[PDB]
């Protein structure tokens, strides 16, 4: 996963030993990461055709 504790949670050992990691785990699992404003349409070739998300 992306090595960015403001987006992806830290490891359990880091969360239980590091204050920054514990804070980021708390915030990610309570509030969640903020996403910059904007709209996107991303599509993939799912087995049934184009599957997209706007």
């Amino acid at each position: 996963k992306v090595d960015d504790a403001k987006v992806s949670p830290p490891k359990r050992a880091e969360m239980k030993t590091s204050m920054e990691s514990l804070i980021h785990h708390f915030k990610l699992y309570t509030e969640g990461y903020q996403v910059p404003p904007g709209a996107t349409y991303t599509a993939i070739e799912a087995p049934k055709g184009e599957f997209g998300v706007y």
Partner: protein
């Protein structure tokens, strides 16, 4: 440490027990009330106190990464023991 209410109903570790006039006791007729017999408060009271010769000790609950976040307890107050509040574990400096 389970205890029995005056109506014969077991009292949970949260002190929950329906009153005598409470109609909601009907749900237990011809059935049972789910009560956990082990009381964490009683067990942690049964646990002893660890004596360490340091002003500050660290507790992670045992097991390392399988326990709780590591915290530091200041053992300077000689009138009481320092309790790690993640696991309720008491530590103390050697007196006498």
């Amino acid at each position: 440490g389970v205890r029995t209410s005056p109506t014969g109903e077991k009292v949970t570790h949260t002190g929950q027990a329906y009153d005598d006039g409470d109609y909601r006791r009907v749900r237990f007729s011809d059935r049972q009330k789910e009560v956990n017999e082990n009381f964490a408060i009683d067990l942690i009271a049964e646990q002893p106190v660890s004596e360490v010769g340091s002003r500050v000790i660290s507790c992670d609950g045992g097991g390392g990464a399988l326990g709780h976040p590591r915290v530091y307890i200041n053992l300077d107050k000689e009138t009481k023991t320092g309790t790690c509040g993640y696991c309720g574990l008491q530590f103390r400096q050697p007196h006498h």
